[PDB]
């Protein structure tokens, strides 16, 4: 029957849900001015120029890779730990997590937020890869991701030392198969008592169908600029949207749940680190 979010916050407040599974994409990191895809405006639909590519997904793309690795390296200097912090939104996830609710965050950022809002790796899986490790694209040796830092902040292509192949972050590109971690959805997602959606288009494959996989009793609540993908075309009669800025979306949640207060002083402290 039509839920509304404080529908969605009773059940949490009456543990009626206790194994929540989360699903993120960029929107959730534009406030921490990383830009996404598709926001108009700043997204990288409307910025090819800068980073002298032909269309977005050219930057995930390995013949476009081979052919010019440069925009990707440009992406990975930006990206790489130091530069950006999480938001709001991320240290949500992170209460989420300490008040014993988050039964796995799946991720297709590659901002390396969520681990350092404080996540622990074992709740984590980061479904299109991650700057932390490194493989030559020629021989396979793998490199932690601070072997090849000097190279990506000179702007410089970084080469293996065995064999001169090029070095590439285990970033997942088109084609790519996901990581092994992945495989957590097979269990994760019928056990899950609620979904949570934000910030993404869902327009990548396999990880936006997962959405489906929840069993059809529990409730999918987005909070998202727009109603988007699977939830979009085939709608059920728990999902609950959300519409709008998504740190306020999670505010306004995070209020019907009793911790605003905890969610300020923990972003208080957590970025004053930083
Ligand atoms: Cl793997
Ligand atoms: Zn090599």
């Known amino acids: 029957?039509?839920?509304?979010?404080?529908?969605?916050?009773?059940?949490?407040?009456?543990?009626?849900?206790?194994?929540?599974?989360?699903?993120?994409?960029?929107?959730?990191?534009?406030?921490?001015?990383?830009?996404?895809?598709?926001?108009?405006?700043?997204?990288?639909?409307s910025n090819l120029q800068q980073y002298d590519?032909?269309?977005?997904?050219?930057?995930?793309?390995?013949?476009?890779?081979?052919?010019?690795?440069?925009?990707?390296?440009t992406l990975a200097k930006e990206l790489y730990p130091g530069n950006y912090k999480p938001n709001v939104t991320h240290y949500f996830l992170r209460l989420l997590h300490d008040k014993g609710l988050l039964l796995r965050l799946y991720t297709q950022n590659i901002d390396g937020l969520e681990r350092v809002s404080g996540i622990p790796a074992s709740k984590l899986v980061e479904?299109?890869?991650?700057?932390?490790?490194?493989?030559?694209?020629?021989?396979?040796?793998?490199?932690?991701?601070?072997?090849?830092?000097?190279?990506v902040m000179a702007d410089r292509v970084p080469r293996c030392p065995v064999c001169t192949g090029v070095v590439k972050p285990d970033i997942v590109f088109f084609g790519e198969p996901l990581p092994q971690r992945f495989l957590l959805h097979v269990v994760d997602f019928p056990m899950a008592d609620l979904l949570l959606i934000l910030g993404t288009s869902l327009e990548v494959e396999p990880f936006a169908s997962l959405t489906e996989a929840v069993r059809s009793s529990v409730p999918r609540?987005?909070?998202?600029?727009?109603?988007?993908?699977?939830?979009?075309?085939?709608?059920?009669?728990?999902?609950?949207?959300?519409?709008?800025?998504?740190?306020?979306?999670?505010?306004?949640?995070?209020?019907?749940?009793?911790?605003?207060?905890?969610?300020?002083?923990?972003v208080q402290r957590e970025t004053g680190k930083l």
């Open 1 to 45: 029957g039509k839920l509304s979010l404080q529908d969605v916050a009773e059940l949490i407040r009456a543990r009626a849900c206790q194994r929540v599974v989360v699903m993120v994409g960029a929107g959730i990191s534009t406030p921490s001015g990383i830009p996404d895809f598709r926001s108009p405006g700043s997204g990288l639909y």
């Open 53 to 73: 590519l032909p269309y977005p997904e050219a930057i995930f793309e390995l013949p476009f890779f081979f052919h010019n690795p440069k925009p990707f390296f």
């Open 127 to 151: 479904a299109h890869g991650t700057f932390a490790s490194a493989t030559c694209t020629v021989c396979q040796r793998p490199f932690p991701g601070e072997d090849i830092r000097a190279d």
């Open 221 to 266: 609540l987005l909070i998202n600029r727009d109603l988007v993908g699977p939830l979009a075309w085939h709608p059920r009669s728990r999902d609950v949207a959300q519409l709008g800025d998504v740190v306020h979306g999670v505010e306004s949640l995070v209020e019907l749940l009793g911790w605003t207060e905890e969610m300020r002083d923990l």
